Design a protein around this ligand. Structure first.
Ligand SMILES: *[C@@H]1O[C@H](CO)[C@@H](O[C@@H]2O[C@H](CO)[C@@H](O)[C@H](O[C@@H]3O[C@H](CO)[C@@H](O)[C@H](O)[C@@H]3O)[C@H]2NC(C)=O)[C@H](O)[C@H]1NC(C)=O
Ligand SMILES: *[C@@H]1O[C@H](CO)[C@@H](O[C@@H]2O[C@H](CO)[C@@H](O[C@@H]3O[C@H](CO)[C@@H](O)[C@H](O)[C@@H]3O)[C@H](O)[C@H]2NC(C)=O)[C@H](O)[C@H]1NC(C)=O
Ligand SMILES: *[C@@H]1O[C@H](CO)[C@@H](O[C@@H]2O[C@H](CO)[C@@H](O[C@@H]3O[C@H](CO)[C@@H](O)[C@H](O)[C@@H]3O)[C@H](O)[C@H]2NC(C)=O)[C@H](O)[C@H]1NC(C)=O
Ligand SMILES: CCCCCCCCCCCCCCCC
Ligand SMILES: *[C@@H]1O[C@H](CO)[C@@H](O)[C@H](O)[C@H]1NC(C)=O
Ligand SMILES: *[C@@H]1O[C@H](CO)[C@@H](O)[C@H](O)[C@H]1NC(C)=O
Ligand SMILES: *[C@@H]1O[C@H](CO)[C@@H](O)[C@H](O)[C@H]1NC(C)=O
Ligand SMILES: *[C@@H]1O[C@H](CO)[C@@H](O)[C@H](O)[C@H]1NC(C)=O
Ligand SMILES: *[C@@H]1O[C@H](CO)[C@@H](O)[C@H](O)[C@H]1NC(C)=O
Ligand SMILES: *[C@@H]1O[C@H](CO)[C@@H](O)[C@H](O)[C@H]1NC(C)=O
Ligand SMILES: *[C@@H]1O[C@H](CO)[C@@H](O)[C@H](O)[C@H]1NC(C)=O
Ligand SMILES: *[C@@H]1O[C@H](CO)[C@@H](O)[C@H](O)[C@H]1NC(C)=O
Ligand SMILES: [Ca+2]
Lengths: 930, 49, 49, 49
């Protein structure tokens, strides 16, 4: 491999670079200031938009005749064909000119805003036409916002009438006019709209499962309760109770639990499993509901206490229960008369009036979606009357954009009805919000405020919610959160679920939620990127609060990553000489070169096809001198310096030898971006990530100060192991001015045959297995195990694997992956939680011998750990004895339901709720029961 | 329940897969909107069908 | 007519509900299936059977 | 008669409903559909016939 040769190369050129410090405190403070600057820019855009929306709606005169004055708008769900006949009677439809923009990745028109109207909502109605008229001012303010900040993503006006007017005119996603693609999108059900349209809730959904709801009414009630839960965010707490002559909880929850995805699925399953039987008692159900809303022993959103009565009808107004429990009327009661029936709805409508609530009817599936949006419409009354204190910008949980942009957050701001203000008029429905303004922030807009390329591959940033969900994390993927076993939701991954959970990490998580700033160096169990290995890492977490927001940014930084190599390439011809070693023509003098697809130049487009990107990079390097402000100087300088360093190893130490019997490929990978592998025949078999910071072996080999044997993948059809080799890697540990830097990882793809020979050559001076960390078979001598090279040991011989775990030569950590796509079982591929385990050297001892007491027999083994490497030799001598192969140790991504949420709501993770919330105002007009 | 409201499309939940169907202000086949339509309707009633 | 209303147009091995509420027959004079459907046994029959 | 997805208007839940259902069965029209409902309400073909 040439560890010492590349080390000597690095200290021999200390004049070509300057070792700079990675001051974690300064990095976190700077990145948190950048994040708060971005979020405050978006907040300013939101304030502009909401101010203009209120100003322009307040100056809008109603009409019922838009034929004499058409409204001209672009319907997002309109075909691109020039159809002049596709105009509604009351509206003229725009046909836009669509450019393709890289920031959005779709067809985008910056001239005007697009409008989404739900299919269930007719676009020619008076309500919709008036909205489409007064929102053109929003259109030009959209244009102003985008011209003051060209990095702006979607800025949208979610209207309370159903319309969404978002600025960059783009056609709706796939459901404009398409069979099997129906548009069920409604802006008033979006998490940002729901978040900005009211304060966090405390529901108790009371379900009336009595005899009278059997059949259709029960079906409608359970679908309605599911769609009601689908409007609850993570700041809302919910329980579902059912009553028939006595009330009970539908699920394992005995108190208001947080309305996150897993708890909501528990409640949805409990509702779906519910049955209709018995007589009704509205007093014993409301007693239960009010008692559960008074349970302050548990985590709650101490705000907006609600009861959602999902009944059909009855002749019981239940006066005295309401008088006893709701006398000052701290709890709203929303009553739903679900089903197609003729029962008395009078008491149901009265419960809403006497309890500040609202009455809704759901006669069929199809009315379900709208009435829930409407309780939200009611809940915003105290928020409107608290005029300008309520207009605070909130940031939604991370979710997947409807018009696909990946993971985004979005800042919300309610828009209020201001027709009579300082000229006080009747102001009938001025207690309702006009809508919610939104502005999207991409997680990749935040990822470029946290640059990771002066950091080690093991170092990274991550932000956190007050619920603990990560705004930013290397392990947060653009996939919906798995919620259980398979048979429009936020991607809310907790911090303790994105990583491996210690107790130090729980204390750090709580400190980050609390908004404190601190540092903590400790020993971690760093799970490897391939998710098969675990390292006893050595990390330093430094966190700060992102001011002006409820976020908290931290930086994970290894103890060897406090210094980095800032390339001192300014001779303009030395970097050129390093450049010619990159061109895809010298891949026999120098090794098969891969460049890491980073953002070196603004005009480089990164590609997965690495040779295409290498060609583009070489083209850009050819003519570089005039491109001073287009190319990132530091990244290109570092990659050129490291290209020179690896050339002076592939030539001066490999090309002078050119062949070794045991090896099959010699590779060097640098944190600059170069991953040269010598022969170029085994360079085709090289299937590691071109980006060096995403290489599992690289990050694995920086933690270990040993030689790391990366066992290959078993039963994976590709380059394989026999014709590619089995990887060995060590990280160079150069010292510059007494500073430990580990800038590269040299390695060897040891040939399997050249090693099996040397494994069995000295037998003259059969069962003998070589195992690495994680218990993966590097090979055996039995020549039948070597067929299964790179396979987990427990799959092969479970008894010895389980025993070796029992002696604790191998500990393990079983964790849950919440974002894994999944083959759906029976009661394409869906998303489940997988339950993944990783083994590792538990103890520091070297020799492990004992007797394997297999059933009615006995086996003897001896384990010895090879020094300066992650391997163990297991000298187990027992084959074909009595079978204790009763089961297997399948180390893989076992599909499973996650942690039992019934048990982890009794001891829930620490969580901080929103500070200011608006409920129970006295200027409120409760006389609109509907 | 009004002709004003009953325009555009609605989400039909009949075929077990949601489909957008046009909203149409139709009249029932036998409808008493006339003494001649009432006569035919009452004839169909008298035949029992 | 014994047991002749029990074969319906079933989809391809999905074992779900049949398409159409009519009996079928894979033979010549009977009503045939269409739409990549098979006319196989165990359908309760018309009018809930 | 509170079946899934439907409650027939020709039921015997109230006295007006039962009296209209019996009157309609006397006039003979669609008495068989009411019969199918009354069979399927007592368990289907297996035990309600
Ligand atoms: C199994 O096969 C051969 C044994 O025939 C191993 O090679 C030999 O390994 C020993 C290790 O103790 C070396 O001394 C032998 O010579 C060495 O070669 C290196 C090459 O640069 C010199 O620098 C050393 O000074 C020394 O002379 C070495 N001989 C040969 C011909 O390779 C081989 O490594 C092993 N296979 C595997 C996969 O490990
Ligand atoms: C914001 O609040 C204002 C009122 O404060 C709303 O404007 C009012 O909307 C109502 C419709 O509910 C209008 O009443 C209608 O008037 C027409 C013509 O007179 C009549 O034919 C209809 O039957 C109906 O009564 C009312 O004129 C209008 N203006 C005022 C001053 O009340 C406005 O709709 C609210 N914002 C939104 C987005 O809805
Ligand atoms: C993940 O893997 C780690 C591996 O360290 C597991 O932590 C280890 O758990 C064992 C079992 O409790 C601990 O042993 C115990 O130590 C205490 C105190 O020394 C002693 O009183 C007990 O009798 C027992 O020997 C071990 O210390 C602990 N290791 C560390 C570094 O804390 C962990 O349980 C695994 N699972 C999870 C979910 O983290
Ligand atoms: C434009 C309105 C014309 C109405 C014509 C409707 C059809 C008339 C059919 C009349 C059938 C009457 C049967 C009663 C005989 C006893
Ligand atoms: C946040 O504000 C506090 C006090 O106002 C200050 O000490 C801290 O440096 C600020 N952090 C950032 C990242 O600006
Ligand atoms: C915010 O907008 C200003 C222009 O108004 C711009 O100069 C600045 O770079 C922006 N900040 C961020 C973090 O995008
Ligand atoms: C409302 O409509 C009238 C007539 O169509 C138009 O003059 C006015 O500009 C519209 N309002 C807005 C805010 O565009
Ligand atoms: C949930 O469904 C199972 C499966 O039939 C049933 O046995 C159980 O009784 C149901 N739960 C309740 C609370 O009835
Ligand atoms: C909460 O705790 C108190 C004291 O431990 C107890 O009296 C009460 O029953 C508990 N539950 C509720 C709902 O208050
Ligand atoms: C980091 O590793 C060293 C030995 O490599 C160890 O002594 C030290 O305790 C580790 N750091 C922490 C915070 O434990
Ligand atoms: C990558 O791009 C190069 C040049 O554009 C081309 O020769 C090569 O076939 C491409 N490889 C793949 C896998 O697309
Ligand atoms: C090993 O297995 C025994 C049972 O054979 C069990 O009691 C014990 O907890 C296991 N673990 C250790 C560390 O002994
Ligand atoms: Ca009842």
């Amino acid at each position: 491999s040439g560890v010492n040769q590349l080390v000597d190369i690095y200290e021999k050129y200390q004049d070509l670079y300057t070792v700079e410090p990675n001051n974690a405190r300064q990095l976190v403070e700077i990145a948190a200031r950048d994040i708060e600057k971005l979020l405050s820019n978006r907040s300013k855009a939101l304030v502009r938009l909401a101010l203009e929306a209120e100003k322009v709606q307040a100056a809008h005169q109603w009409r019922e005749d838009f034929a004499s004055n058409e409204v001209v708008y672009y319907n997002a769900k309109d075909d691109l064909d020039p159809e002049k006949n596709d105009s509604e009677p009351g509206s003229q439809r725009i046909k836009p000119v669509f450019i393709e923009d890289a920031n959005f990745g779709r067809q985008i028109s910056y001239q005007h805003a697009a409008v989404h109207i739900p299919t269930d909502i007719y676009e020619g109605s008076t309500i919709v036409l008036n909205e489409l008229n007064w929102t053109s001012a929003l259109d030009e303010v959209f244009k102003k916002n985008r011209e003051e900040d060209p990095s702006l993503l979607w800025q949208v006006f979610g209207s309370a009438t159903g319309l969404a007017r978002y600025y960059p005119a783009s056609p709706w996603v796939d459901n404009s006019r398409t069979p099997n693609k129906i548009d069920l999108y409604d802006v008033r059900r979006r998490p940002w709209y729901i978040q900005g349209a009211a304060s966090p809730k405390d529901m108790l959904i009371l379900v009336d499962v009595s005899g009278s709801v059997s059949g259709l009414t029960l079906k409608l009630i359970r679908t309605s309760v599911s769609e009601m839960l689908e409007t609850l965010s993570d700041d809302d707490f919910v329980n579902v109770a059912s009553f028939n002559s006595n009330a009970q909880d539908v699920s394992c929850f005995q108190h208001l639990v947080q309305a996150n995805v897993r708890n909501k699925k528990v409640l949805k399953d409990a509702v779906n499993n519910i049955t209709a039987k018995g007589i009704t008692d509205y007093k014993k159900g409301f007693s239960f509901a009010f008692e559960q809303l008074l349970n302050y022993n548990v985590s709650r959103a101490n705000c907006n206490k609600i009861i959602m009565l999902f009944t059909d009808g009855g002749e019981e107004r239940a006066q005295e229960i309401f008088n006893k429990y709701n006398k000052d009327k701290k709890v709203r009661v929303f009553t739903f008369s679900v089903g197609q029936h003729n029962y008395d709805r009078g008491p149901i409508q009265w419960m809403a009036c006497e309890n500040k609530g609202y009455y809704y009817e759901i006669p069929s599936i199809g009315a379900i979606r709208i009435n829930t949006q409407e309780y939200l419409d009611v809940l915003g009354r105290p928020m409107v009357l608290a005029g300008d204190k309520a207009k605070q910008v909130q940031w939604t949980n991370v979710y997947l954009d409807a018009l696909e942009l990946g993971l985004v957050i979005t800042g919300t701001l309610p828009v209020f009805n201001i027709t009579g203000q300082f000229e006080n008029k009747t102001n009938l429905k001025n207690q309702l919000i006009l809508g919610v303004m939104g502005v999207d922030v991409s997680l990749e807009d935040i990822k470029r405020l946290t640059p990771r390329f002066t950091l080690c591959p093991n170092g990274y940033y991550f932000a956190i919610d007050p619920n603990g969900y990560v705004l930013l994390h290397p392990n947060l993927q653009p996939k919906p959160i798995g919620v259980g076993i398979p048979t429009q939701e936020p991607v809310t991954l907790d911090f303790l679920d994105a990583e491996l959970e210690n107790d130090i990490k729980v204390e750090i998580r709580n400190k980050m939620i609390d908004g404190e700033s601190g540092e903590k160096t400790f020993r971690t169990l760093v799970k490897s990127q391939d998710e098969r290995y675990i390292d006893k890492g050595n990390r330093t977490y430094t966190w700060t609060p992102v001011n002006g927001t409820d976020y908290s940014l931290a930086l994970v930084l290894p103890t060897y990553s406090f210094y980095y190599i800032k390339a001192k390439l300014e001779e303009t011809i030395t970097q050129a000489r390093y450049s010619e070693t990159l061109k895809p023509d010298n891949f026999e003098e120098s090794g098969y070169t891969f460049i890491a697809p980073r953002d070196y130049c603004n005009d480089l487009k990164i590609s997965d096809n690495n040779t295409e990107f290498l060609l583009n990079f070489n083209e850009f390097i050819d003519r570089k001198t005039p491109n001073n402000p287009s190319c990132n100087a530091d990244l290109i300088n570092r990659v050129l310096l490291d290209a020179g360093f690896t050339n002076e190893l592939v030539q001066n130490y490999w090309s002078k030898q050119k062949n070794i019997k045991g090896v099959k490929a010699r590779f060097v990978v640098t944190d600059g971006g170069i991953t040269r592998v010598y022969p170029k025949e085994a360079g085709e078999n090289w299937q590691e990530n071109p980006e060096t910071y995403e290489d599992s072996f690289y990050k694995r080999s920086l933690d270990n100060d040993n030689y790391v044997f990366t066992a290959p993948y078993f039963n994976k059809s590709g380059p394989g192991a026999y014709e590619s080799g089995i990887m060995v890697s060590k990280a160079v540990e150069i010292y510059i001015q007494g500073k430990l830097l580990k800038p590269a990882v040299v390695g060897i793809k040891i040939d399997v045959n050249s090693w099996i020979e040397n494994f069995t050559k000295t037998s003259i001076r059969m069962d003998c297995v070589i195992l690495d960390d994680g218990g993966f078979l590097l090979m055996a001598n039995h020549d039948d195990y070597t067929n299964q090279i790179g396979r987990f040991f427990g799959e092969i011989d479970p008894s010895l694997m389980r025993h070796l775990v029992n002696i604790s030569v191998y500990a393990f950590n079983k964790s849950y992956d919440y974002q894994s796509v999944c083959e759906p079982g029976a009661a394409s591929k869906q998303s489940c939680i997988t339950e993944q385990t990783q083994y590792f050297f538990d103890n520091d001892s070297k020799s492990f011998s004992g007797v394997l007491d297999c059933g009615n027999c006995s086996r003897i083994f001896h384990g010895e750990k090879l020094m300066n490497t992650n391997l163990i030799f297991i000298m187990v001598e027992s084959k074909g004895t009595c079978p204790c192969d009763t089961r297997l140790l399948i180390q893989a991504e076992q599909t499973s339901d996650g942690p039992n949420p019934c048990d982890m709501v009794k001891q829930p993770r620490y969580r901080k709720g929103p500070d200011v919330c608006f409920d129970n105002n006295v200027l409120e007009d409760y006389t609109d029961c509907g | 329940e009004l002709e004003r409201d009953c325009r555009g499309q609605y989400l039909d939940y009949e075929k077990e897969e949601v489909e957008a169907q046009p909203r149409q202000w139709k009249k029932y086949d036998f409808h008493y909107d006339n003494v001649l339509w009432a006569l035919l309707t009452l004839f169909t009633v008298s035949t029992g069908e | 007519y014994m047991g002749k209303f029990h074969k319906a147009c079933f989809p391809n091995s999905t074992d779900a509900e049949p398409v159409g509420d009519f009996p079928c027959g894979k033979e010549a004079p009977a009503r045939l299936c269409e739409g990549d459907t098979e006319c196989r046994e165990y359908w309760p029959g018309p009018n809930f059977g | 008669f509170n079946f899934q997805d439907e409650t027939p208007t020709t039921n015997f839940d109230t006295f007006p409903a039962a009296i209209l259902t019996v009157f309609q069965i006397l006039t003979g029209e669609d008495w068989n559909a009411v019969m199918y409902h009354g069979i399927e309400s007592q368990g289907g073909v297996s035990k309600g016939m």
